[PDB]
Design a protein around this nucleic acid. Structure first.
Length: 56
DNA sequence: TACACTTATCTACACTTATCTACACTTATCTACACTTATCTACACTTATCTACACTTATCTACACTTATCTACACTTATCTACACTTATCTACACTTATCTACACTTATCTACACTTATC
């Protein structure tokens, strides 16, 4: 995720419209979806592929 | 420069104060858990936006009449050439003043020599 990467390089989950401002729950849902992608799943599990392994 | 006396700088040594480590108690920070409010989705009603259709006004074309623009023609005035007379410009010639060279006298500049003061 770019969110945690100070150089901004990575991926992000975003609202579609550039003009919208995200609601209080939407900002958290977007962070959850990012985390889900990183973990490739709901829970953390070292036995599962990371997103890096998936992409490779 | 050379020489002597005393003061300032530097080293060595002992005592107490400041800095640092180790140990115990309570407060601040963090996690876990339950309740209620704010955010979001789904659904129904009326208002605003958009399309289609008819009527009259503004825009555009076509046509005739007179005014302004343009050409052609004649008369006098301004511009240009040619010609004669006197004034300004230029050359040639003589006289005196300013510039330049040569010559003598005294003053300023430079060298040499002795005594004391500053520097060492």
């Amino acid at each position: 995720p770019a969110r945690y990467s100070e150089k901004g390089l990575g991926f992000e989950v975003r609202l579609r419209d550039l003009d919208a401002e995200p609601g209080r729950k939407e900002k958290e849902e977007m962070k959850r979806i990012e985390d889900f992608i990183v973990n490739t799943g709901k829970d953390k599990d070292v036995d599962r592929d990371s997103f890096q392994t998936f992409c490779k």
